[PDB]
């Protein structure tokens, strides 16, 4: 294992430059498939390298001392998207790992999902812990650096008749996924804080979900295999 890296000071705010959620429909998205669970109470890894390092390298090549960024996730439905996650970064260091920034917002979450979903350590993936089957679907990631957008789709397939006995299904029954927004709605403006809720940064978020997982007798994996461009064990 490794010790935690050294801390660096940053300013946390509710918002930075964006008050509305960026449209997820700004371009085409490469498609990946999350790896099937070995058992229903396992962890789904929405992980795939966005190759955002290219954009940081460009900042260095043009001798720009900082970069700006944001990350958003969405559930894609027919003709519209449900909100899921949004965070913004400013005064970021292009010679450090993504997200090493002097300014960042609180992550903004769809709270029912935040009960069992949280970002990966590098902040560019999501982990989905012991999901109810209702979580099946198409998850889009937006990674943006200096106004350049990278889009990635993650297909989450969960077999019919398989569900974790302690899956979080209570909040979904009450709140579901929230409203669904078309491209034209994103263009007119969907207010971030109107529909999403400020939340913990990734490390305490991970540990809050981990506490629930461990209380139910399960241990988070030490590593997570990336989503693949092909489907593994596809159904019907």
CA gap 154, 167 in Å, rounded: 21
28 φ/ψ sector (left φ>0, alpha ψ -120 to 50, else beta) = beta
| Cβ contacts of 111 within 8 Å, gap of 6 or more | 171, 175, 197, 199
Resolution in A: 1.5
Buried b (16+ CB within 10 A) or exposed e, 211-225: eebeeeebeeeeebe
> How many angstroms separate the CA atoms of 104 and 80, rounded?
28
Q: What is the DSSP pairing of strand 180-181 with strand 80-92?
A: antiparallel
Containing structural domain, residue 81 = 1-236
DSSP line for 60-104:
HHTT-S-EEEEEEEEEEETTEEEEEEEEEEEEE-TTSSTT-EEEE
The CA distance from 119 to 83, in Å, is 15
Q: CA 85 to CA 101: how far, in whole Å?
A: 19
Secondary-structure breakdown of the chain: helix, strand, coil percentages, each rounded to the nearest 5: 20, 30, 50
Contacts of 85 (CB under 8 A, 6+ apart): 71, 72, 73, 107, 108, 109, 110, 119, 126, 196
Q: Which residues pair with 103 in a beta bridge?
A: 11, 90
Q: Which residues of 30-41 are buried (b: 16+ CB within 10 A; e: fewer)?
A: ebbbbbbbeebb
Torsion of CA 97, 108, 83, 19, to 10 degrees: -90
CA proximity to 113, closest of 73, 161, 152: 73
- The owner of tokens 């609180």 is 106
CB atoms within 10 A of CB 184: 10
| DSSP 8-state assignment for residue 225 | P
Q: Measured between alpha carbons, how far is residue 40 from residues 128, 156, 158, 165, 211 in Å?
A: 11, 13, 8, 8, 18
Characterize the bridge pairing of strands 67-77 and 43-46.
unpaired
- Assign residue 146 a region (left: φ > 0; alpha: ψ between -120 and 50; beta: otherwise): left
The pair of structure tokens assigned to 151 is: 């889009």
Written as six digits, the tokens of 38 are 């070995």
Residue 175, number of CB atoms within 10 A of its CB: 12
Domains identified in the chain, total number: 1
Instruction: Tell me the HSE value of 117 on the side-chain side, using a 13 A CA sphere.
Output: 24
Length of the chain: 236
């Amino acid at each position: 294992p490794t010790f935690p890296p050294p801390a660096y000071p940053y300013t946390e705010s509710w918002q930075l430059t964006l008050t509305t959620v960026p449209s997820p429909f700004v371009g085409p998205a490469d498609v990946y498939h999350t790896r099937p669970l070995e058992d229903p109470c396992g962890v789904v890894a929405l992980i795939s390298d966005p190759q955002v390092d290219r954009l940081l390298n460009e900042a260095v090549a043009h001798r720009r001392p900082t970069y700006r960024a944001h990350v958003a996730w969405y559930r894609i439905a027919d003709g519209c998207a449900h909100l899921l996650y949004f965070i913004e970064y400013a005064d970021c260091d292009p010679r450090q790992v993504f997200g090493r920034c002097r300014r960042r917002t609180t992550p903004m979450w769809w709270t029912p999902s935040a009960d069992y979903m949280f970002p990966t350590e590098d902040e560019l993936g999501l982990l989905m812990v012991a999901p109810g089957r209702f979580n099946e679907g198409q998850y889009r990631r937006l990674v943006s650096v200096d106004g350049v957008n990278i889009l990635t789709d993650f297909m989450v397939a969960l077999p019919e008749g398989q569900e974790c006995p302690f899956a979080r299904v209570d909040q979904h029954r009450t709140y579901k996924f929230g409203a669904c927004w078309s491209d034209d709605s994103f263009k007119r403006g969907v207010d971030v804080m109107r529909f999403l809720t400020p939340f913990y940064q990734q490390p305490p978020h991970r540990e809050v979900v981990n506490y629930w997982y461990r209380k139910n007798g399960r241990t988070l994996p030490r590593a997570y295999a990336a989503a693949t461009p092909y489907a593994i064990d596809p159904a019907r």
